[PDB]
Amino acid sequence: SEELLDLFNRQVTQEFTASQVYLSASIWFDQNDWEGMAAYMLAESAEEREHGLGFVDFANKRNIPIELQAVPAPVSCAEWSSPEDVWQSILELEQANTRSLLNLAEAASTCHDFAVMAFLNPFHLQQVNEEDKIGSILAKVTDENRTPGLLRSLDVVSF
Amino acid sequence: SEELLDLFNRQVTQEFTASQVYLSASIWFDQNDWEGMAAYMLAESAEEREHGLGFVDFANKRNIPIELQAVPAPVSCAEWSSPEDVWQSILELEQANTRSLLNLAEAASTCHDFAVMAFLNPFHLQQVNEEDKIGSILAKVTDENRTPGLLRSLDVVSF
Amino acid sequence: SEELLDLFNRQVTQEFTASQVYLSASIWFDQNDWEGMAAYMLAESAEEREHGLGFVDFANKRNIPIELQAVPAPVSCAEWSSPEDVWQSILELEQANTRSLLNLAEAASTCHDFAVMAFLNPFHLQQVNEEDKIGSILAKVTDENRTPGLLRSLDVVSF
Amino acid sequence: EELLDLFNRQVTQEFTASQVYLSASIWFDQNDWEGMAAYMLAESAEEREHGLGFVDFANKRNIPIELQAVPAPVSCAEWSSPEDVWQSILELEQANTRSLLNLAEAASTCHDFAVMAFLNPFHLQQVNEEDKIGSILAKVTDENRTPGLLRSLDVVS
Amino acid sequence: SEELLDLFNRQVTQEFTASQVYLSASIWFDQNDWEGMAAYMLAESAEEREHGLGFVDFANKRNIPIELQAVPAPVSCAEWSSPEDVWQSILELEQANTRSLLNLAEAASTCHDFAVMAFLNPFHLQQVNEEDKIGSILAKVTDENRTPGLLRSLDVVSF
Ligand SMILES: [Fe+3]
Ligand SMILES: [Fe+3]
Ligand SMILES: [Fe+3]
Ligand SMILES: [Fe+3]
Ligand SMILES: [Fe+3]
Ligand SMILES: [Fe+3]
Ligand SMILES: [Fe+3]
Ligand SMILES: [Fe+3]
Ligand SMILES: [Fe+3]
Ligand SMILES: [Fe+3]
Ligand SMILES: [Fe+3]
Ligand SMILES: [Fe+3]
Ligand SMILES: [Fe+3]
Ligand SMILES: [Fe+3]
Ligand SMILES: [Fe+3]
Ligand SMILES: [Fe+3]
Ligand SMILES: [Fe+3]
Ligand SMILES: [Fe+3]
Ligand SMILES: [Fe+3]
């Protein structure tokens, strides 16, 4: 019971942690003049914030008390020295959002909490699409960057 | 007091000097068949002329006498043998426009000339955006030109 | 700063003093059948009251207490005998308004009151425009009035 | 090529004229002739467009252009009334016309039919311009015979 | 006199010869799967036909008898083994159209035939723009083809 409350609460922190990692990725791309990839990251930073606010709003409706935790400093921007490194961290970040949601669904399932299971369904399916989209961008970036300059030519055109 | 008059007057010459450097860059790019970069430079040549005319118009309103100086021949087109060289001179040129405006703001500040400080504010912020935009283009051009031909393929698509 | 609060209060008084002086000019012009110059003066009497109202609204928001002072009786109308005299008094009035504003900005700058200085900026620039416009009308009035009846032909035309 | 040199000098002459027009705009604004000031500011932008048109044709025709300094205007020092300013501007347009005719004579000697064709609309624009300027100068010279009267007509044009 | 008739007549053959060379270039590009460059050539083939018909129409109006000559087989498509070779032949072809028009203008000039000189003026200026545009495309193609594959990537995007 309490475990469900705790995992709901942790989900909000995970989505806001992901919002800040995406903002860090936007900064790294703008600082290195990848304005197209920076705008994509900034849009995802706002979207993850929206995911967190949806969990807050449902929790309030369901009388699940939310206590906002610290949103950790992103520190993957330590590692990053090329756009591949940034997109690989973003892929790992979406995988962690997916695992957080599955853990939460498992707790709900154990509790027979059908309303929380229902609420999570569109997020499970969102995550499938997000991991697919980021996986695909990572593949494109890794392939284009085999030729000097070429990756730039595709921040400019796409994004 | 007089120093403020002189620096106002010099600002007009700096913006018209920059207008002519951008026209020289347009010529170098058209002569070398970079029609996209040439059209960007020609647009900036007109914009710097507009900055100079705004300083003339304010000076007339504020009874700061303007005496138009010679606009020097651009001679950076000596150096240029690749688009990187052109964009690097343009970056240096915007940095000199920014320094000219800051010197002018310092004189105004010393004189407690609040109207001239206010007038300069949108130009300080314009310059921040211009140095950022030219820095970013220079980075893109330097990276694309690591592969023969590739830079061309992006005059054509962007610009 | 007592100085800064008093000068803010004084600025409201100066804008309302100027409103009344413009209304006095409108009466002189209407009495002497210069209906075009009267309507100009009436529009400016309303604009200077809007300036004073702008200062009262910002003072209220910034917790600057406003004590409304008397708006003195205009005295120049006792001595005006031609349009040139009236326009010369309005130029002087505008020069006063600008001095009052620069005094207030000097007090704000000493107090490092960044918000008050930022509020004043559009008024600094408006005064450059108003002094230029009045000085140019005064110049046209003074030249046209060298031929009998010619200035009348220009209240009728412009205004 | 004296042809090449004259084509470069034409760019410099148009930008020289742009600056002389801007200097006339400033003398008029300083002296509260805002109407005549706006006419000269428009001409200053038009002359810069004539120079840009020359640069563009030279780039297409592979005529190398090397931008020269644009000399500071000096006729403002002597102006004391609008008639002086307008008289300098008529002299400036006569100089622009002469520069175009010198370029056209070299193109004709060279049998450069493309450059002669390119110049034709500029020869006709100069006729129109010298006419308009000579007409305004005549109107200003006549109106300024009565004190104040010229002013009364800046404000109405 | 007769020389003017002959050179008018030869101009029609030159424009129709150029129409067929452009059609040959379209075929070579379609056969080698350069559909963007093929469509440009086909458009120029129709345009040169239009230039020839304009000369026919003026000649009819001016009572210059036209006798249509054989339009020669294009045989530059012998040489061609890369798009650079095609564009270089097209540049040479526009240079020959320009020379044909200048020869014709010289004959008209000698004859003091002011109507034929006037008629040719827009064609002299068309040619300046055409040689500039083809020169520029040739430069782009020669530079892009320094990297395998890259030129293709710009038939697809431009054209
Ligand atoms: Fe997302
Ligand atoms: Fe997304
Ligand atoms: Fe999320
Ligand atoms: Fe996500
Ligand atoms: Fe700019
Ligand atoms: Fe720009
Ligand atoms: Fe500038
Ligand atoms: Fe700039
Ligand atoms: Fe006002
Ligand atoms: Fe006003
Ligand atoms: Fe006021
Ligand atoms: Fe006022
Ligand atoms: Fe003109
Ligand atoms: Fe001109
Ligand atoms: Fe002109
Ligand atoms: Fe064509
Ligand atoms: Fe074409
Ligand atoms: Fe043709
Ligand atoms: Fe052609």
Side-chain angles (χ1 to χ4, degrees):
Chain A
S1 157
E2 286 274 9
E3 192 191 49
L4 194 55
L5 152 51
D6 172 49
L7 285 186
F8 223 96
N9 200 256
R10 286 185 190 285
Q11 193 64 30
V12 178
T13 309
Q14 179 60 37
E15 299 300 342
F16 287 168
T17 292
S19 181
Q20 288 293 100
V21 176
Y22 274 115
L23 178 65
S24 187
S26 88
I27 293 171
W28 188 92
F29 282 128
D30 269 332
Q31 284 176 343
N32 294 275
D33 300 309
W34 295 91
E35 286 94 1
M37 293 177 189
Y40 188 103
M41 298 302 82
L42 186 66
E44 283 290 337
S45 175
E47 182 179 285
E48 293 290 357
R49 177 155 193 282
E50 289 306 321
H51 297 169
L53 292 179
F55 274 83
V56 173
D57 180 42
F58 185 85
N60 291 340
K61 291 190 290 190
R62 247 286 299 270
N63 306 114
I64 293 167
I66 290 295
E67 313 236 329
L68 300 172
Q69 306 168 335
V71 188
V75 287
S76 56
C77 190
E79 311 292 58
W80 292 336
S81 50
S82 60
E84 302 172 38
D85 293 333
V86 187
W87 291 100
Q88 174 66 38
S89 292
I90 293 314
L91 177 63
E92 290 166 6
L93 170 74
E94 292 289 2
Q95 291 167 342
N97 285 349
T98 298
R99 290 194 301 277
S100 182
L101 287 162
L102 289 170
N103 286 340
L104 174 55
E106 293 279 15
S109 176
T110 291
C111 295
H112 297 215
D113 194 320
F114 299 96
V116 167
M117 289 187 284
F119 176 70
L120 300 178
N121 290 159
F123 293 96
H124 291 134
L125 293 181
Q126 179 155 49
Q127 291 301 112
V128 167
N129 291 343
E130 287 191 359
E131 294 190 18
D132 170 69
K133 181 163 192 176
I134 301 302
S136 171
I137 289 175
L138 175 64
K140 296 180 173 34
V141 161
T142 292
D143 196 23
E144 287 197 23
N145 210 33
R146 296 174 61 209
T147 289
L150 179 62
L151 181 66
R152 207 51 95 163
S153 70
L154 307 270
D155 183 76
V156 161
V157 123
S158 328
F159 300 111
Chain B
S1 157
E2 286 274 9
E3 192 191 49
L4 194 55
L5 152 51
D6 172 49
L7 285 186
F8 223 96
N9 200 256
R10 286 185 190 285
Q11 193 64 30
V12 178
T13 309
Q14 179 60 37
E15 299 300 342
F16 287 168
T17 292
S19 181
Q20 288 293 100
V21 176
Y22 274 115
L23 178 65
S24 187
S26 88
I27 293 171
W28 188 92
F29 282 128
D30 269 332
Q31 284 176 343
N32 294 275
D33 300 309
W34 295 91
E35 286 94 1
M37 293 177 189
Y40 188 103
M41 298 302 82
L42 186 66
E44 283 290 337
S45 175
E47 182 179 285
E48 293 290 357
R49 177 155 193 282
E50 289 306 321
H51 297 169
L53 292 179
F55 274 83
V56 173
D57 180 42
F58 185 85
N60 291 340
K61 291 190 290 190
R62 247 286 299 270
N63 306 114
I64 293 167
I66 290 295
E67 313 236 329
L68 300 172
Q69 306 168 335
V71 188
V75 287
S76 56
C77 190
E79 311 292 58
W80 292 336
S81 50
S82 60
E84 302 172 38
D85 293 333
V86 187
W87 291 100
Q88 174 66 38
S89 292
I90 293 314
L91 177 63
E92 290 166 6
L93 170 74
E94 292 289 2
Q95 291 167 342
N97 285 349
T98 298
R99 290 194 301 277
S100 182
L101 287 162
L102 289 170
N103 286 340
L104 174 55
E106 293 279 15
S109 176
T110 291
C111 295
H112 297 215
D113 194 320
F114 299 96
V116 167
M117 289 187 284
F119 176 70
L120 300 178
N121 290 159
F123 293 96
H124 291 134
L125 293 181
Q126 179 155 49
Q127 291 301 112
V128 167
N129 291 343
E130 287 191 359
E131 294 190 18
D132 170 69
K133 181 163 192 176
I134 301 302
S136 171
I137 289 175
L138 175 64
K140 296 180 173 34
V141 161
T142 292
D143 196 23
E144 287 197 23
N145 210 33
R146 296 174 61 209
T147 289
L150 179 62
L151 181 66
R152 207 51 95 163
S153 70
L154 307 270
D155 183 76
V156 161
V157 123
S158 328
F159 300 111
Chain C
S1 190
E2 188 53 54
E3 204 211 359
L4 169 66
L5 308 168
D6 287 351
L7 290 168
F8 206 105
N9 204 240
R10 282 147 142 243
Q11 187 63 31
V12 173
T13 306
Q14 176 60 30
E15 294 300 340
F16 294 160
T17 296
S19 182
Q20 286 290 95
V21 173
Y22 273 122
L23 174 62
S24 77
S26 86
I27 290 167
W28 191 95
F29 280 132
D30 265 330
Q31 288 175 348
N32 289 278
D33 301 307
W34 296 90
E35 289 92 353
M37 295 176 184
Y40 189 105
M41 299 297 179
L42 198 76
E44 288 291 323
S45 177
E47 185 192 281
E48 295 288 2
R49 184 168 178 275
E50 298 298 329
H51 296 166
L53 292 173
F55 277 74
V56 167
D57 184 37
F58 180 85
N60 291 344
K61 287 185 304 182
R62 236 297 292 278
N63 313 112
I64 293 171
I66 290 297
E67 231 86 66
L68 295 181
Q69 312 178 277
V71 193
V75 295
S76 301
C77 37
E79 304 293 317
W80 287 340
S81 61
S82 65
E84 193 181 327
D85 293 336
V86 186
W87 286 103
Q88 170 72 37
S89 290
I90 294 303
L91 178 65
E92 288 168 19
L93 178 68
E94 288 296 354
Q95 291 166 345
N97 282 352
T98 296
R99 282 185 333 264
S100 183
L101 283 165
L102 291 175
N103 288 343
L104 181 51
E106 297 272 16
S109 184
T110 296
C111 284
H112 296 31
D113 194 324
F114 294 105
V116 170
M117 287 186 283
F119 175 73
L120 300 178
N121 284 158
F123 293 90
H124 290 133
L125 296 179
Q126 166 81 189
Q127 286 309 110
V128 166
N129 285 352
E130 293 199 352
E131 288 192 30
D132 171 68
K133 175 141 170 197
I134 291 150
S136 169
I137 293 166
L138 175 61
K140 292 169 184 30
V141 168
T142 298
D143 195 13
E144 294 198 28
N145 204 41
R146 294 185 321 116
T147 285
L150 179 64
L151 181 68
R152 199 61 88 156
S153 69
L154 303 270
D155 186 74
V156 167
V157 121
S158 347
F159 294 113
Chain D
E1 278 306 275
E2 85 151 4
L3 196 283
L4 155 69
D5 171 55
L6 287 177
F7 210 100
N8 274 282
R9 292 215 270 184
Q10 193 61 36
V11 174
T12 303
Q13 176 63 31
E14 301 293 351
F15 290 165
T16 299
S18 180
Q19 288 290 89
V20 175
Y21 274 115
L22 180 54
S23 82
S25 184
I26 289 165
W27 184 91
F28 282 133
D29 265 326
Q30 281 172 176
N31 288 276
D32 302 308
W33 297 86
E34 288 84 6
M36 292 174 192
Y39 186 99
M40 297 299 179
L41 193 61
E43 290 300 324
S44 174
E46 175 169 336
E47 296 286 3
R48 175 163 179 284
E49 297 294 328
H50 297 166
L52 292 179
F54 278 79
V55 172
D56 184 45
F57 181 83
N59 287 351
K60 292 189 300 190
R61 239 293 294 281
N62 303 114
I63 289 167
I65 286 304
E66 276 198 14
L67 294 183
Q68 313 287 309
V70 185
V74 307
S75 61
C76 181
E78 335 283 304
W79 293 336
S80 48
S81 58
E83 305 178 35
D84 286 340
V85 186
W86 288 105
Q87 176 66 36
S88 288
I89 296 302
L90 182 58
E91 289 164 3
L92 177 69
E93 288 294 0
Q94 300 170 337
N96 283 353
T97 294
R98 89 183 28 107
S99 69
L100 283 165
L101 287 169
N102 297 336
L103 176 59
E105 296 278 15
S108 175
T109 295
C110 286
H111 299 232
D112 191 327
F113 291 107
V115 166
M116 283 185 286
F118 175 71
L119 304 174
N120 279 160
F122 296 90
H123 296 312
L124 294 179
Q125 176 180 39
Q126 286 310 102
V127 168
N128 286 348
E129 288 196 3
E130 286 189 34
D131 174 79
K132 181 152 187 198
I133 303 301
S135 177
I136 296 170
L137 175 59
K139 293 170 185 21
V140 160
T141 293
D142 194 13
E143 295 201 10
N144 210 29
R145 291 164 64 204
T146 289
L149 180 65
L150 184 66
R151 193 64 89 160
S152 79
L153 299 280
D154 188 63
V155 318
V156 183
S157 324
Chain E
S1 157
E2 286 274 9
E3 192 191 49
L4 194 55
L5 152 51
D6 172 49
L7 285 186
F8 223 96
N9 200 256
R10 286 185 190 285
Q11 193 64 30
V12 178
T13 309
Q14 179 60 37
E15 299 300 342
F16 287 168
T17 292
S19 181
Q20 288 293 100
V21 176
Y22 274 115
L23 178 65
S24 187
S26 88
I27 293 171
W28 188 92
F29 282 128
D30 269 332
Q31 284 176 343
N32 294 275
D33 300 309
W34 295 91
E35 286 94 1
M37 293 177 189
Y40 188 103
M41 298 302 82
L42 186 66
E44 283 290 337
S45 175
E47 182 179 285
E48 293 290 357
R49 177 155 193 282
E50 289 306 321
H51 297 169
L53 292 179
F55 274 83
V56 173
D57 180 42
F58 185 85
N60 291 340
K61 291 190 290 190
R62 247 286 299 270
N63 306 114
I64 293 167
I66 290 295
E67 313 236 329
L68 300 172
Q69 306 168 335
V71 188
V75 287
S76 56
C77 190
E79 311 292 58
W80 292 336
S81 50
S82 60
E84 302 172 38
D85 293 333
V86 187
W87 291 100
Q88 174 66 38
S89 292
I90 293 314
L91 177 63
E92 290 166 6
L93 170 74
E94 292 289 2
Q95 291 167 342
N97 285 349
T98 298
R99 290 194 301 277
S100 182
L101 287 162
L102 289 170
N103 286 340
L104 174 55
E106 293 279 15
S109 176
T110 291
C111 295
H112 297 215
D113 194 320
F114 299 96
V116 167
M117 289 187 284
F119 176 70
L120 300 178
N121 290 159
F123 293 96
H124 291 134
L125 293 181
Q126 179 155 49
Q127 291 301 112
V128 167
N129 291 343
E130 287 191 359
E131 294 190 18
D132 170 69
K133 181 163 192 176
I134 301 302
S136 171
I137 289 175
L138 175 64
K140 296 180 173 34
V141 161
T142 292
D143 196 23
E144 287 197 23
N145 210 33
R146 296 174 61 209
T147 289
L150 179 62
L151 181 66
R152 207 51 95 163
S153 70
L154 307 270
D155 183 76
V156 161
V157 123
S158 328
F159 300 111

